[PDB]
Amino acid sequence: ATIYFSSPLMPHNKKVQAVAGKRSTLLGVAQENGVKIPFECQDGNCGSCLVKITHLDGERIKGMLLTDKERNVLKSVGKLPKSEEERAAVRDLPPTYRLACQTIVTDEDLLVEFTGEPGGA
Amino acid sequence: ATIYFSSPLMPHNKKVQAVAGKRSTKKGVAQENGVKIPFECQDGNCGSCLVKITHLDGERIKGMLLTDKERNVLKSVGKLPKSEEERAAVRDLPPTYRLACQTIVTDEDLLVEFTGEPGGA
Amino acid sequence: MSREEVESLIQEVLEVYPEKARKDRNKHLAVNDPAVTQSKKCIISNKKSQPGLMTIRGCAYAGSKGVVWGPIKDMIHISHGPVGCGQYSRAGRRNYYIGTTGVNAFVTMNFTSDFQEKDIVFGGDKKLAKLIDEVETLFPLNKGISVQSECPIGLIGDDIESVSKVKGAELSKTIVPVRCEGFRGVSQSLGHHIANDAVRDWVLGKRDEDTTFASTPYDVAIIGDYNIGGDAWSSRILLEEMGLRCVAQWSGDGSISEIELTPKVKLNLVHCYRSMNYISRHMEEKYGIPWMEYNFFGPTKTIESLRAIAAKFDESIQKKCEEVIAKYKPEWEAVVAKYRPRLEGKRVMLYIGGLRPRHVIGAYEDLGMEVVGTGYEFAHNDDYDRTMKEM
Amino acid sequence: YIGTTGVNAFVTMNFTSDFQEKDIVFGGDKKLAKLIDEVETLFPLNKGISVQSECPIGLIGDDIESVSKVKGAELSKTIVPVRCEGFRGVSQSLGHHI
Amino acid sequence: AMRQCAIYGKGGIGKSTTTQNLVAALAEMGKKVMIVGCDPKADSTRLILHSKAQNTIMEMAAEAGTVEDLELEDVLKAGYGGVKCVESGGPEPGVGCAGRGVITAINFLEEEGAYEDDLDFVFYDVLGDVVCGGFAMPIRENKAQEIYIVCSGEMMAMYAANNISKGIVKYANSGSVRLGGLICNSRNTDREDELIIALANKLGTQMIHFVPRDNVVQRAEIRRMTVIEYDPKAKQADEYRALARKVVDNKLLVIPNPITMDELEELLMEFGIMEVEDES
Amino acid sequence: MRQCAIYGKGGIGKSTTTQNLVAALAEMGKKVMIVGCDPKADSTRLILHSKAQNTIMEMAAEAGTVEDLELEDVLKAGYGGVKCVESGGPEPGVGCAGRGVITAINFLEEEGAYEDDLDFVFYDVLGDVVCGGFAMPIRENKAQEIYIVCSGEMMAMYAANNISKGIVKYANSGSVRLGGLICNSRNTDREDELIIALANKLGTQMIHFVPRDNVVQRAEIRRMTVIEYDPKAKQADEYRALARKVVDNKLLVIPNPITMDELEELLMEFGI
Amino acid sequence: MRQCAIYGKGGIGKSTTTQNLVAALAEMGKKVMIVGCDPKADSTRLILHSKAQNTIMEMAAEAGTVEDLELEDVLKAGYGGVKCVESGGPEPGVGCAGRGVITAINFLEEEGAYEDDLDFVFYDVLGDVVCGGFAMPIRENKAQEIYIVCSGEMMAMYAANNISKGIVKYANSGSVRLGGLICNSRNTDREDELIIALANKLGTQMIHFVPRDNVVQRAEIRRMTVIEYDPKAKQADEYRALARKVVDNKLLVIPNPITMDELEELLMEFGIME
Amino acid sequence: AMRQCAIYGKGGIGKSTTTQNLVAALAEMGKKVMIVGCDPKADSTRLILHSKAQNTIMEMAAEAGTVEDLELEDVLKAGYGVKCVESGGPEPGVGCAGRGVITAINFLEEEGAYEDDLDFVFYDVLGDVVCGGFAMPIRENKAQEIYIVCSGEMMAMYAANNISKGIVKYANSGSVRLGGLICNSRNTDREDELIIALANKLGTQMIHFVPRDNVVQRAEIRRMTVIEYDPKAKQADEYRALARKVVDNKLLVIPNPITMDELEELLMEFGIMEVEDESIVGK
Ligand SMILES: Nc1ncnc2c1ncn2[C@@H]1O[C@H](COP(=O)(O)OP(=O)(O)O)[C@@H](O)[C@H]1O
Ligand SMILES: Nc1ncnc2c1ncn2[C@@H]1O[C@H](COP(=O)(O)OP(=O)(O)O)[C@@H](O)[C@H]1O
Ligand SMILES: Nc1ncnc2c1ncn2[C@@H]1O[C@H](COP(=O)(O)OP(=O)(O)O)[C@@H](O)[C@H]1O
Ligand SMILES: Nc1ncnc2c1ncn2[C@@H]1O[C@H](COP(=O)(O)OP(=O)(O)O)[C@@H](O)[C@H]1O
Ligand code: ICS
Ligand code: CLF
Ligand code: SF4
Ligand code: SF4
Ligand code: FES
Ligand code: FES
Ligand SMILES: [Mg+2]
Ligand SMILES: [Mg+2]
Ligand SMILES: [Mg+2]
Ligand SMILES: [Mg+2]
């Protein structure tokens, strides 16, 4: 899996290789590579690790499970439209915005954008 | 070279493999793979093929030549800021917005975004 | 009848639960109104099971290895992890196949890594490569390997994708890694999705640059029929008598080459929407192959589906379809005449995980029986959209 | 430089592909792969190869990156492809950047 | 068989009224046709559905998550014997390209498969004032095989007709887009029938039926219906039918010869519309 | 220096009204510059007495690029000392039709043609669509005052509503305001009160009413503006009243859009 | 069904002014509801009389998630007409502090607590910074009318300027407009005409000028509004006057932001700052 | 050699004045100090540079296009011998108000301003709320010693309790500790004792008590610090006294935050809040 990290705080976009499906999440890959996504909780409720994820290989999008905890936090931050909620519930397709501490790496190419601000502006 | 095409008109982002440095430009790569970037001239003077380029491997950014023809067209559609014009003149680094019919593929990973509209909105 | 009675029954049944369990389970019980087109406001599905309530659901490994990948006969499927998962699913599903087991077919066999403590502590990637090497000498006639991962594989952080790539490049073999860990997903449905993604990403696009296959305007592919007791063979004989050529069968009695020949085929006939709608949508978007849902449960649904399928071809196929219907009419008329008087008026309750409760309702109604209850362990809201009209 | 020219130092020597009309028309990358094998045969003490591309290489269409990757891993030696075609850039300045 | 058509012209000359009346005539002869409204104001389906300004794809895609989630039945309605109607709509004024809705709607129709086999004609009503952008996309992407330009005796409508013919010849090599003819809508100005005939001869194309003005058109519009249905026995009803028969029987699809601005001025003085001009 | 822009649908008298506007303004001794932002290049013919002023876009393509272009070859003075600029568009189907406005406005700032103690700058802008370089004066805060020239017709009133929607979108990011509704007559009954009804719906006062006559067309053959043709004419003073009402306009109000039925009810209740 | 928001710097009596305002509107046959968007949940204590109303954020975490939350457990009518909701906020340093407002406002629409019997809806929103969920009323068009509670002190006038800047940014997107200024008085000289000077330059109007009193101090111990404690109090009539002008206020304007010097020059002339 | 410091507190209590005067006092002892304004108000370098207002990082980044092109020399202004920077903030309503702090600290580290050519580095951080940006210096281990300006006000102590909650939250992954508490005179009789008790409840010390002096306004109109305006004044002596005990500070403790009830009972103890009873609630 190839992950491209992008942020205005970063002078250059960073390209990393990651093992898919690890118990350690996207937060693991970011922390091992010095990508400074703000992590401010250990229970997955603060929403400060909000990132925008783009599947660069659109043919290779993997079905996943959006847990009830991540879904509720995305609503509390506001980064979950009603159509994306229905898409996840019916088609098991990931939404545009994810929580990095709760995101499992899949076998594809990803673009991860964050602003350095916690979820909720 | 790996190129990821992205557009609201495209249902999925398309990933292609391209040969760097070909005389046929990114316009060539797009047309072989059926990517519908609007091409409405053969002299490179319209702005119809305007695209946004993101260098995903920020370390592997290649120095290039911003041709005076492309520079003037990018200014005629209001897509070349003064800071990026100075960066191209002094550091030979590509600007964010490019003309696909005038863009030479380099040996890196690129994300190419277009709206389906000609340059100049 | 007795809609208010049904509502009161639901309410008095829900009283034993604690507040959380009661509140969640209230969303999952409904009284059918056939006039509704959108099930989700009426009923909720595809949610996590309440802990400690004795659910009937399985895991993603069951939905991937046991459902989609297992029926493929000339491939070897490795249950990567401890021994239990492979042992309990061995030959527990009747997907019929034609072959010599252990030589060129391996459906009823259990290949596993048999993880021990040192495998958990240090990893099983080297063990996986050694296992792949051992499989090739032991079984030289296998035509591909799939690695269905169990819970510890994702829980300890193994890289089965890179091992699959390296070993496949080395041995010129198709090695498909499936990350179908049981804790992923709430039921077998995500196992279906993951298996379909693996098929799309490692198998489907292999005979893309070749054109040696001689196609025909009447080429169809059966999708989502797993030959449970020979169902797919009866469906196949019915389709071939109608004048079509069946190139692929997903995945009962299925071969890897039949899967690879599915892009060439003109039409996709999808018997189960839940398990194989993903690959059908992918094929429609990529190769331009249209797909349709059919039903071969009972004479009424069978005739309706046969006519609908024949409507997609020229008039010779329609004439052959009428010939087939006329030929088979007296047989099921005699069956109905013999058995309907014994079964008339009986009430039946159903509970099967996806598609099949709705799928068999017509067959029951063909014998004078009526379905008081229909239920799904893992169906999504589109399946309920489809089943509300039929109840 | 301090070296033995032709054995372990190669500064004053000219290694070239010598493109002809058939190489201009029919590919050109098969000659490059064959050339790298001959360099290994006749100059075994070299510690790396760089491919400095001239004007026709980018104009006919050639993938010197793949040849560098395929032959580099095969022979376990660094092959550096340089896209320094003369028409790129307005002077020697872009040659430094490339 | 899948005869795709487009109607171009200046804003406010009567493209929508001519298109809907033409389409109503075609259905009367048992022709299954579809109207795609490519005008930004999206009123080219009022007189077929009779309801109101039809909901556009831009509005439906915005209220929903995206275009692929939107339903084909939601935007493509059936009226007047089932002639299918769709409206492209447009973006907010001052934002993006005013023709972006056209690019969005045509892509949605293709992806869904709304171009079903049993359709005979597809008509696009597109504002011709500017050629560029999504308004040139049907020409550029070979979406419309034949083009009919509504034109009047006014200087602007004549100038816009020359601009559209310039677009066709630019894309003539890359596609089958050709000029079908010109439709003269009457403002009751003197010596305009021959003026449009002269322009068509200068352009190298024929001229489709000339449509005299009348107040019966407004009578059917205030009730939100086509003139042919409101009165089938009126002369305008037969005139709209006559325009439709010539459209079906049309076979002269030529590559036009755009003329110079000074030629337009010279040809305007010879009919008395423009007073003769002296530099001194 | 006050920067103004004349917006409106194509063919309602947008050019001739603007030419006679600044012809009267220069009669007061003011220094006014005219920038033609219409792909049709007749926006300055009646103040220069020319067949067709060479557009900046035509000159750049002929002479290499816009860098080689000289200010003298694009800025021509006319009657009254008015500075005249014409920016054409590209050919149909070749890119955005509005690139000419972006190139010209940027060119004029770079050469510093604004700072030369100019009083009024007028942009004659296509108003059929509000997008690309045609919306550029509103987008980039180029023209603070905006006047819409409209008539008692659906398309003319629909165009006025669309420009007002554009003003609202960019109101927060710069001082671009709707100034008034210039109304020209096509000789239709109850047109003065109809457009006034539209204006007070917006909340922006109408500037002046311009009736139709043949005096402007006799001037058109001359290629000389009505004011300079015959200063004693009825309409010659009428543009004087329109010019005087423009220089002395102190109220600018953000517009509020009007829906389709609301505009349809306005047109219907007038008996049309 | 007019929804308003109270914006201002913390410590300027905004929560009390909103509560006495609400108590002033309850008597005159109006059913209103208060939504506490301030992180500290002291904005409904005078109505409910409760020690500390349980916030939506508090009870959502204990009950698992916000889906397992009932409206009758979050919405308490301590006074029969008045409805009180406390949004709550996260602990300091844990995510965005305004995200409690987003959860509560979304929750109330979901359960339909805005139905068929509300005349006024009031939001008591933190105004020190306008971002995240605190700017959510203005950004989402939740509160059409905005009243700023300011003071003679410079930081309060600076806070009023920032809110007006945020209203301008979302003027085109939403109907939200500045409805007026509320001046809460500390015992300093030249205050009412100072804020009138601020309002006159903003293009908006002053609504009222509430002076400091000691009747409010007696009410604090009661955990009650001044209106319910002593309806004959001079402050209690003052709050009726402020309430009556709120209902009968008609002009709603798009504000004009004021620069640093221009705000500063207003302070120097009045002598508030040297 | 570098002692990274931050000053927190509620808006409008005197963070900038006290910080600038203490920093100006430090320069007298030969100390090289850098002031980083982490407040969107952006006036924490006014009295050092004698300027109208320092241009913020957000202003030059927007006017130049991006933060890459920003010269360090344009960003860093030297007045009184002490370097000054202002983070600024985004437009009110969009983004996170603390975004300027995140951008400024990131740019300073990349450009080399934070290198150890300075004895002290100070952050003037708004503490009316603890969120991203304003809590970023605590989270990212960029300010080891935190000093809280607090008055005898209910809101001021509430903010002080909130900032201490932020410190303990990150006390196990970094060395961020609580240096002390600064009391600024709100002209309250019991306030000096009130904050002494608060520091004891929090487990920290009152580093000083600053009395409300009208000589500060006379220096503020001049855009100048109190110490340079009137070195022989006693206000400059208190600022000097605060400076010495800041350097001599060694008690960097992890605080013990108190609850809302314990804050209220502490208010009633010193007479600012009256004694409440449960039987006088309904009347
Ligand atoms: N054949 C006709 N006879 C008389 N009036 C017409 C005719 N066609 C259109 N009109 C009038 O012209 C006006 C504008 O026509 P419309 O079709 O809206 O122009 P567009 O081409 O811009 O859609 C309408 O109000 C209509 O009443
Ligand atoms: N005040 C007027 N009175 C009579 N006719 C006018 C008047 N103004 C313009 N016209 C006519 O209307 C037409 C409008 O065209 P013009 O103003 O040149 O370009 P535009 O399309 O930009 O408005 C002209 O041909 C002119 O003859
Ligand atoms: N109209 C008033 N007259 C006198 N004192 C008031 C008035 N309004 C508020 N106060 C006092 O000001 C303080 C601020 O109250 P509160 O609203 O809780 O703070 P905030 O404005 O930060 O919410 C309260 O202790 C209250 O006693
Ligand atoms: N030591 C002091 N004595 C008297 N007044 C002071 C003192 N320090 C600050 N002030 C006053 O307090 C006001 C606000 O202080 P300031 O430093 O701006 O607060 P902030 O902490 O928000 O920066 C200023 O107008 C100033 O005059
Ligand atoms: S695959 Fe699926 S539970 Fe579609 S996991 Fe299950 S042999 Fe059922 S209702 Mo066993 S989605 Fe097949 C099924 Fe249906 S094993 Fe069989 S009967 S038609
Ligand atoms: S949910 Fe699914 S079936 Fe369960 S383990 Fe997980 S992949 Fe497997 Fe196999 S070995 Fe035994 S039964 Fe489990 S406990 Fe460890
Ligand atoms: S291309 Fe044409 S329609 Fe699109 S923005 Fe430009 S001028 Fe407008
Ligand atoms: S947006 Fe405002 S409330 Fe949210 S984290 Fe940033 S500063 Fe805190
Ligand atoms: S780190 Fe808090 S939600 Fe992810
Ligand atoms: S197609 Fe015209 S510039 Fe590229
Ligand atoms: Mg129309
Ligand atoms: Mg004109
Ligand atoms: Mg409060
Ligand atoms: Mg400050």
PDB file of C-alpha atoms in Angstrom, chain G residues 5-138:
ATOM      1  CA  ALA G   5     -28.322  34.282  19.168  1.00  0.00           C
ATOM      2  CA  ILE G   6     -26.520  36.161  21.944  1.00  0.00           C
ATOM      3  CA  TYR G   7     -22.839  36.708  21.118  1.00  0.00           C
ATOM      4  CA  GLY G   8     -20.257  38.385  23.324  1.00  0.00           C
ATOM      5  CA  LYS G   9     -17.088  38.107  25.344  1.00  0.00           C
ATOM      6  CA  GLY G  10     -17.202  35.913  28.426  1.00  0.00           C
ATOM      7  CA  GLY G  11     -17.949  37.745  31.650  1.00  0.00           C
ATOM      8  CA  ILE G  12     -20.194  40.457  30.175  1.00  0.00           C
ATOM      9  CA  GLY G  13     -23.421  39.229  31.800  1.00  0.00           C
ATOM     10  CA  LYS G  14     -24.649  37.672  28.526  1.00  0.00           C
ATOM     11  CA  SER G  15     -25.999  34.481  30.192  1.00  0.00           C
ATOM     12  CA  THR G  16     -27.952  36.478  32.843  1.00  0.00           C
ATOM     13  CA  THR G  17     -29.194  39.062  30.277  1.00  0.00           C
ATOM     14  CA  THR G  18     -30.476  36.187  28.043  1.00  0.00           C
ATOM     15  CA  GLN G  19     -32.201  34.512  31.061  1.00  0.00           C
ATOM     16  CA  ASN G  20     -33.857  37.700  32.379  1.00  0.00           C
ATOM     17  CA  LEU G  21     -34.784  38.495  28.769  1.00  0.00           C
ATOM     18  CA  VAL G  22     -36.334  35.035  28.441  1.00  0.00           C
ATOM     19  CA  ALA G  23     -38.159  35.409  31.759  1.00  0.00           C
ATOM     20  CA  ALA G  24     -39.433  38.777  30.524  1.00  0.00           C
ATOM     21  CA  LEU G  25     -40.835  37.112  27.392  1.00  0.00           C
ATOM     22  CA  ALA G  26     -42.399  34.122  29.171  1.00  0.00           C
ATOM     23  CA  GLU G  27     -44.922  36.274  31.047  1.00  0.00           C
ATOM     24  CA  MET G  28     -46.284  37.962  27.914  1.00  0.00           C
ATOM     25  CA  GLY G  29     -47.841  34.802  26.477  1.00  0.00           C
ATOM     26  CA  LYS G  30     -44.701  33.731  24.593  1.00  0.00           C
ATOM     27  CA  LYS G  31     -43.181  30.238  24.693  1.00  0.00           C
ATOM     28  CA  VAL G  32     -39.418  30.483  24.167  1.00  0.00           C
ATOM     29  CA  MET G  33     -36.496  28.082  24.471  1.00  0.00           C
ATOM     30  CA  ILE G  34     -32.892  28.703  25.532  1.00  0.00           C
ATOM     31  CA  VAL G  35     -30.034  26.712  23.998  1.00  0.00           C
ATOM     32  CA  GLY G  36     -26.794  27.027  25.936  1.00  0.00           C
ATOM     33  CA  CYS G  37     -23.867  27.021  23.511  1.00  0.00           C
ATOM     34  CA  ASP G  38     -21.342  28.339  26.042  1.00  0.00           C
ATOM     35  CA  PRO G  39     -18.975  25.512  27.102  1.00  0.00           C
ATOM     36  CA  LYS G  40     -19.632  26.150  30.803  1.00  0.00           C
ATOM     37  CA  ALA G  41     -23.257  25.194  31.450  1.00  0.00           C
ATOM     38  CA  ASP G  42     -24.393  28.122  33.595  1.00  0.00           C
ATOM     39  CA  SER G  43     -26.727  29.621  30.971  1.00  0.00           C
ATOM     40  CA  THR G  44     -30.005  28.020  32.144  1.00  0.00           C
ATOM     41  CA  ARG G  45     -29.557  27.885  35.926  1.00  0.00           C
ATOM     42  CA  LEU G  46     -31.813  30.855  36.698  1.00  0.00           C
ATOM     43  CA  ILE G  47     -34.680  29.329  34.709  1.00  0.00           C
ATOM     44  CA  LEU G  48     -34.333  25.679  35.735  1.00  0.00           C
ATOM     45  CA  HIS G  49     -33.191  26.604  39.286  1.00  0.00           C
ATOM     46  CA  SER G  50     -31.028  23.486  38.967  1.00  0.00           C
ATOM     47  CA  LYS G  51     -27.524  23.360  40.415  1.00  0.00           C
ATOM     48  CA  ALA G  52     -26.036  22.309  37.063  1.00  0.00           C
ATOM     49  CA  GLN G  53     -28.146  21.121  34.135  1.00  0.00           C
ATOM     50  CA  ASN G  54     -26.784  17.927  32.606  1.00  0.00           C
ATOM     51  CA  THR G  55     -25.369  18.768  29.193  1.00  0.00           C
ATOM     52  CA  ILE G  56     -26.055  16.828  26.005  1.00  0.00           C
ATOM     53  CA  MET G  57     -22.340  16.072  25.682  1.00  0.00           C
ATOM     54  CA  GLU G  58     -22.241  14.780  29.268  1.00  0.00           C
ATOM     55  CA  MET G  59     -25.182  12.385  28.986  1.00  0.00           C
ATOM     56  CA  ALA G  60     -24.277  11.201  25.476  1.00  0.00           C
ATOM     57  CA  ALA G  61     -20.914   9.866  26.665  1.00  0.00           C
ATOM     58  CA  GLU G  62     -22.399   8.076  29.681  1.00  0.00           C
ATOM     59  CA  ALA G  63     -25.263   6.590  27.634  1.00  0.00           C
ATOM     60  CA  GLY G  64     -22.842   5.254  25.016  1.00  0.00           C
ATOM     61  CA  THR G  65     -23.635   7.620  22.149  1.00  0.00           C
ATOM     62  CA  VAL G  66     -25.980  10.418  21.111  1.00  0.00           C
ATOM     63  CA  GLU G  67     -28.368   7.954  19.437  1.00  0.00           C
ATOM     64  CA  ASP G  68     -29.213   6.431  22.842  1.00  0.00           C
ATOM     65  CA  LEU G  69     -30.253   9.883  24.110  1.00  0.00           C
ATOM     66  CA  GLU G  70     -33.880  10.900  24.659  1.00  0.00           C
ATOM     67  CA  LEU G  71     -35.200  14.426  24.191  1.00  0.00           C
ATOM     68  CA  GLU G  72     -37.143  14.323  27.467  1.00  0.00           C
ATOM     69  CA  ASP G  73     -33.824  13.708  29.240  1.00  0.00           C
ATOM     70  CA  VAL G  74     -32.042  16.708  27.690  1.00  0.00           C
ATOM     71  CA  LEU G  75     -34.915  19.226  27.404  1.00  0.00           C
ATOM     72  CA  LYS G  76     -36.258  20.357  30.782  1.00  0.00           C
ATOM     73  CA  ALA G  77     -39.070  22.885  31.230  1.00  0.00           C
ATOM     74  CA  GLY G  78     -38.288  24.107  34.725  1.00  0.00           C
ATOM     75  CA  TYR G  79     -40.534  27.030  33.919  1.00  0.00           C
ATOM     76  CA  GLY G  80     -43.585  25.771  32.065  1.00  0.00           C
ATOM     77  CA  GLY G  81     -43.146  27.951  28.996  1.00  0.00           C
ATOM     78  CA  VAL G  82     -39.352  28.048  28.965  1.00  0.00           C
ATOM     79  CA  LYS G  83     -37.393  25.162  27.446  1.00  0.00           C
ATOM     80  CA  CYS G  84     -33.733  24.815  28.438  1.00  0.00           C
ATOM     81  CA  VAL G  85     -31.002  22.820  26.679  1.00  0.00           C
ATOM     82  CA  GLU G  86     -27.318  22.777  27.630  1.00  0.00           C
ATOM     83  CA  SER G  87     -25.028  21.716  24.792  1.00  0.00           C
ATOM     84  CA  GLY G  88     -21.863  21.277  26.845  1.00  0.00           C
ATOM     85  CA  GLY G  89     -18.309  20.979  25.647  1.00  0.00           C
ATOM     86  CA  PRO G  90     -15.333  18.622  25.674  1.00  0.00           C
ATOM     87  CA  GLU G  91     -12.524  18.681  28.186  1.00  0.00           C
ATOM     88  CA  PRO G  92      -9.747  21.216  27.499  1.00  0.00           C
ATOM     89  CA  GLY G  93      -7.153  19.999  25.025  1.00  0.00           C
ATOM     90  CA  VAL G  94      -9.407  17.241  23.654  1.00  0.00           C
ATOM     91  CA  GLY G  95     -10.493  18.160  20.137  1.00  0.00           C
ATOM     92  CA  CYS G  96     -12.426  21.244  19.111  1.00  0.00           C
ATOM     93  CA  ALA G  97     -14.226  22.835  22.055  1.00  0.00           C
ATOM     94  CA  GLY G  98     -17.118  24.032  19.885  1.00  0.00           C
ATOM     95  CA  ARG G  99     -18.077  20.555  18.698  1.00  0.00           C
ATOM     96  CA  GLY G 100     -20.554  20.264  21.565  1.00  0.00           C
ATOM     97  CA  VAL G 101     -22.718  22.889  19.862  1.00  0.00           C
ATOM     98  CA  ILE G 102     -22.789  20.944  16.584  1.00  0.00           C
ATOM     99  CA  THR G 103     -23.987  17.785  18.339  1.00  0.00           C
ATOM    100  CA  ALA G 104     -26.717  19.582  20.296  1.00  0.00           C
ATOM    101  CA  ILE G 105     -28.084  21.704  17.441  1.00  0.00           C
ATOM    102  CA  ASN G 106     -28.162  18.677  15.132  1.00  0.00           C
ATOM    103  CA  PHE G 107     -29.806  16.606  17.878  1.00  0.00           C
ATOM    104  CA  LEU G 108     -32.617  19.124  18.370  1.00  0.00           C
ATOM    105  CA  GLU G 109     -33.527  19.206  14.672  1.00  0.00           C
ATOM    106  CA  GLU G 110     -33.391  15.402  14.552  1.00  0.00           C
ATOM    107  CA  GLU G 111     -35.912  15.023  17.393  1.00  0.00           C
ATOM    108  CA  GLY G 112     -38.024  17.964  16.194  1.00  0.00           C
ATOM    109  CA  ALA G 113     -37.835  20.115  19.326  1.00  0.00           C
ATOM    110  CA  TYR G 114     -38.508  23.185  17.129  1.00  0.00           C
ATOM    111  CA  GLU G 115     -42.149  22.301  16.459  1.00  0.00           C
ATOM    112  CA  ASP G 116     -45.390  24.209  16.441  1.00  0.00           C
ATOM    113  CA  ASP G 117     -45.201  26.030  19.788  1.00  0.00           C
ATOM    114  CA  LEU G 118     -41.958  28.057  19.781  1.00  0.00           C
ATOM    115  CA  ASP G 119     -42.096  31.829  19.375  1.00  0.00           C
ATOM    116  CA  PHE G 120     -38.422  32.553  20.115  1.00  0.00           C
ATOM    117  CA  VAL G 121     -35.272  30.430  20.176  1.00  0.00           C
ATOM    118  CA  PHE G 122     -32.240  31.922  21.923  1.00  0.00           C
ATOM    119  CA  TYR G 123     -28.637  30.738  21.649  1.00  0.00           C
ATOM    120  CA  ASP G 124     -26.147  31.823  24.323  1.00  0.00           C
ATOM    121  CA  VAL G 125     -22.907  31.400  22.378  1.00  0.00           C
ATOM    122  CA  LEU G 126     -19.305  31.961  23.414  1.00  0.00           C
ATOM    123  CA  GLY G 127     -18.000  35.028  21.602  1.00  0.00           C
ATOM    124  CA  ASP G 128     -14.308  35.241  22.522  1.00  0.00           C
ATOM    125  CA  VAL G 129     -13.433  33.329  19.339  1.00  0.00           C
ATOM    126  CA  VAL G 130     -15.789  32.651  16.427  1.00  0.00           C
ATOM    127  CA  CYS G 131     -14.757  29.292  14.978  1.00  0.00           C
ATOM    128  CA  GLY G 132     -15.849  25.681  14.913  1.00  0.00           C
ATOM    129  CA  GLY G 133     -19.199  25.159  16.585  1.00  0.00           C
ATOM    130  CA  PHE G 134     -19.369  28.677  18.007  1.00  0.00           C
ATOM    131  CA  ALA G 135     -19.510  30.139  14.496  1.00  0.00           C
ATOM    132  CA  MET G 136     -21.962  27.366  13.588  1.00  0.00           C
ATOM    133  CA  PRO G 137     -25.197  29.464  14.161  1.00  0.00           C
ATOM    134  CA  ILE G 138     -23.911  32.179  11.723  1.00  0.00           C
TER     135      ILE G 138
END
